[PDB]
Enzyme design. Structure first.
Site, PDB file in Angstrom:
ATOM      1  N   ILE A   8       4.838   3.829  -7.822  1.00  0.00           N
ATOM      2  CA  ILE A   8       4.120   4.595  -7.140  1.00  0.00           C
ATOM      3  C   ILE A   8       4.166   4.447  -5.613  1.00  0.00           C
ATOM      4  CG2 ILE A   8       1.436   4.682  -6.271  1.00  0.00           C
ATOM      5  CD1 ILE A   8       0.489   4.238  -9.079  1.00  0.00           C
ATOM      6  N   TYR A  51       0.946  -5.551   0.187  1.00  0.00           N
ATOM      7  CA  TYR A  51       1.108  -6.982   0.090  1.00  0.00           C
ATOM      8  C   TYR A  51       2.130  -6.950  -1.197  1.00  0.00           C
ATOM      9  CZ  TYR A  51      -3.183  -7.779   2.550  1.00  0.00           C
ATOM     10  OH  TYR A  51      -4.351  -7.728   3.661  1.00  0.00           O
ATOM     11  N   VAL A  77       3.453  -1.229  -6.119  1.00  0.00           N
ATOM     12  CA  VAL A  77       2.468  -0.716  -6.835  1.00  0.00           C
ATOM     13  C   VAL A  77       3.229   0.298  -8.000  1.00  0.00           C
ATOM     14  CG1 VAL A  77       0.497   0.701  -6.871  1.00  0.00           C
ATOM     15  CG2 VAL A  77       0.912  -0.434  -4.940  1.00  0.00           C
ATOM     16  N   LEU A  98      -5.411   7.242 -10.174  1.00  0.00           N
ATOM     17  CA  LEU A  98      -5.969   8.232  -9.446  1.00  0.00           C
ATOM     18  C   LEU A  98      -4.536   9.124  -9.423  1.00  0.00           C
ATOM     19  CD1 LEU A  98      -8.965   9.215  -8.284  1.00  0.00           C
ATOM     20  CD2 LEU A  98      -8.288   6.893  -8.852  1.00  0.00           C
ATOM     21  N   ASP A 120      -2.564  10.737  -3.597  1.00  0.00           N
ATOM     22  CA  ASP A 120      -3.092  10.291  -2.416  1.00  0.00           C
ATOM     23  C   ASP A 120      -3.378  11.136  -1.423  1.00  0.00           C
ATOM     24  OD1 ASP A 120      -0.541  10.187  -0.463  1.00  0.00           O
ATOM     25  OD2 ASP A 120      -0.111   8.741  -2.046  1.00  0.00           O
ATOM     26  N   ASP A 133      -8.145  -1.381   6.567  1.00  0.00           N
ATOM     27  CA  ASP A 133      -6.675  -0.746   6.741  1.00  0.00           C
ATOM     28  C   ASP A 133      -6.832   0.498   5.959  1.00  0.00           C
ATOM     29  OD1 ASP A 133      -3.884  -0.323   7.351  1.00  0.00           O
ATOM     30  OD2 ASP A 133      -3.165  -1.301   5.629  1.00  0.00           O
TER      31      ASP A 133
HETATM   32  N1  06Z Z   1      -5.438   3.708  -8.074  1.00  0.00           N
HETATM   33  C1  06Z Z   1      -4.316   3.895  -7.506  1.00  0.00           C
HETATM   34  N2  06Z Z   1      -3.724   5.344  -8.195  1.00  0.00           N
HETATM   35  C2  06Z Z   1      -2.862   5.615  -7.580  1.00  0.00           C
HETATM   36  N3  06Z Z   1      -2.183   6.800  -7.835  1.00  0.00           N
HETATM   37  C3  06Z Z   1      -0.737   7.592  -7.353  1.00  0.00           C
HETATM   38  C4  06Z Z   1      -0.419   7.236  -5.958  1.00  0.00           C
HETATM   39  C5  06Z Z   1       0.639   8.085  -5.497  1.00  0.00           C
HETATM   40  C6  06Z Z   1       1.333   9.057  -6.289  1.00  0.00           C
HETATM   41  C7  06Z Z   1       1.093   9.180  -7.589  1.00  0.00           C
HETATM   42  F1  06Z Z   1       1.458  10.139  -8.331  1.00  0.00           F
HETATM   43  C8  06Z Z   1      -0.255   8.442  -8.176  1.00  0.00           C
HETATM   44  S1  06Z Z   1      -2.410   4.601  -6.112  1.00  0.00           S
HETATM   45  C9  06Z Z   1      -3.672   3.585  -6.641  1.00  0.00           C
HETATM   46  C10 06Z Z   1      -3.913   2.372  -5.737  1.00  0.00           C
HETATM   47  O1  06Z Z   1      -4.941   1.797  -6.167  1.00  0.00           O
HETATM   48  C11 06Z Z   1      -2.949   1.830  -4.549  1.00  0.00           C
HETATM   49  C12 06Z Z   1      -2.621   0.279  -4.558  1.00  0.00           C
HETATM   50  C13 06Z Z   1      -1.981  -0.160  -3.530  1.00  0.00           C
HETATM   51  C14 06Z Z   1      -1.697   0.694  -2.222  1.00  0.00           C
HETATM   52  C15 06Z Z   1      -2.157   2.260  -2.581  1.00  0.00           C
HETATM   53  C16 06Z Z   1      -2.756   2.657  -3.666  1.00  0.00           C
END
Ligand code: 06Z
EC number: 2.7.11.22
Length: 294
Positions: free
Chosen positions: A10, A15, A18, A79, A82, A123
């Site tokens: 992702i 830190y 993902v 999710l 973003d 942040d």
């Molecule tokens: N829950 C979640 N879903 C995500 N879905 C997603 C994010 C980008 C592209 C995509 F196609 C799906 S990211 C995300 C995070 O909790 C997160 C963790 C660290 C930094 C930023 C976000």
């Protein structure tokens, strides 16, 4: 981990990395964040375990925190996209105002909740605001330095974005207040409206000076105590404040007045999330659904 099948990467969180992952057992799809390291903090894993109980419709649900093998994993509900991506995808046409308003309103609700529970995000940025097909937007990747801390980098050489950082942080304030989150959200609100970052600084001083050039260099009149801040220099250039109508055209006066309150220099004058929710800008708020290309 061993109970997951990393589907894709992702991104590079704050830190660690993902991943979009699938629980080999429940088959549920989640976002998995990996964190770094000769023991791991104990105060962290506790301030982290407090986030598990921080459940709200506008907060990305933290499912689990697994500490094992010097590595720390955070399992979050997945999710679809973003806000950063959605804004880039909407760059030609711009996000419809009713949707901008709905997103701002929901994020203020999420902040009101976090703040009422004494949790700060610290942040906020488009990249950690997640949206779904149903029109909801949620706060993610809480950076609580009150957790693992606020290190110099994520974990492996990655440029930290300063565009949404409140001035008091840049001026060296030791204790953050909930006001830092309102500032970041005001910056995001402007960016959704104009389709360009409000303060795109490439270094701490450039970030600071970009804010000063737009809102005027702060002084004791608008911000009591500012000249006594840790990194304040009497030698800072003195820019006059720019006419605000120049800042976020063509946002209407209701939106502009709310934005100006979210961008007050003095953290104590800056509007709270709770009050922001009562602002007239939200009298006609609705909940449109975004056009998402997944
Ligand atoms: N829950 C979640 N879903 C995500 N879905 C997603 C994010 C980008 C592209 C995509 F196609 C799906 S990211 C995300 C995070 O909790 C997160 C963790 C660290 C930094 C930023 C976000």
């Amino acid at each position: 981990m061993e109970n997951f099948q990393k589907v894709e990467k992702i991104g590079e969180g704050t830190y660690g990395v993902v991943y979009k992952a699938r629980n080999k057992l429940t088959g549920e799809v989640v976002a998995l964040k990996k964190i770094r390291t000769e023991g791991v903090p104990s105060t962290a894993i506790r301030e982290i375990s407090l986030l598990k109980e921080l459940n709200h419709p506008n907060i990305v649900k933290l499912l689990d925190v697994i500490h094992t093998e010097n590595k720390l994993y955070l399992v979050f509900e997945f999710l679809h996209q973003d806000l950063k991506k959605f804004m880039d995808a909407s760059a030609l046409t711009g996000i419809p105002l009713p949707l901008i308003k709905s997103y701002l309103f929901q994020l203020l609700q999420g902040l009101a909740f976090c703040h009422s529970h004494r949790v700060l995000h610290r942040d906020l940025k488009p990249q950690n605001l997640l949206i779904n097909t149903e029109g909801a937007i949620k706060l993610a990747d809480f950076g609580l330095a009150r957790a693992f801390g606020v290190p110099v980098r994520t974990y492996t050489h990655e440029v930290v974005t300063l565009w949404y950082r409140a001035p008091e942080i840049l001026l060296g304030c030791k204790y953050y207040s909930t006001a830092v989150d309102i500032w970041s959200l005001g910056c995001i609100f402007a960016e959704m409206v104009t389709r360009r970052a409000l303060f795109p600084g490439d270094s701490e001083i450039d970030q600071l000076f970009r804010i000063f050039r737009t809102l005027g260099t702060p002084d004791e009149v608008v911000w009591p105590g500012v000249t006594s801040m840790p990194d304040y220099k009497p030698s800072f250039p003195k820019w006059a404040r720019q006419d605000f109508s120049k800042v976020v055209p063509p946002l209407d006066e209701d939106g502009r007045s709310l934005l100006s309150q979210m961008l007050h220099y003095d953290p104590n004058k800056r509007i709270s999330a709770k009050a922001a929710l009562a602002h007239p800008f939200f009298q006609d708020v609705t909940k449109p659904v975004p056009h998402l290309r997944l």
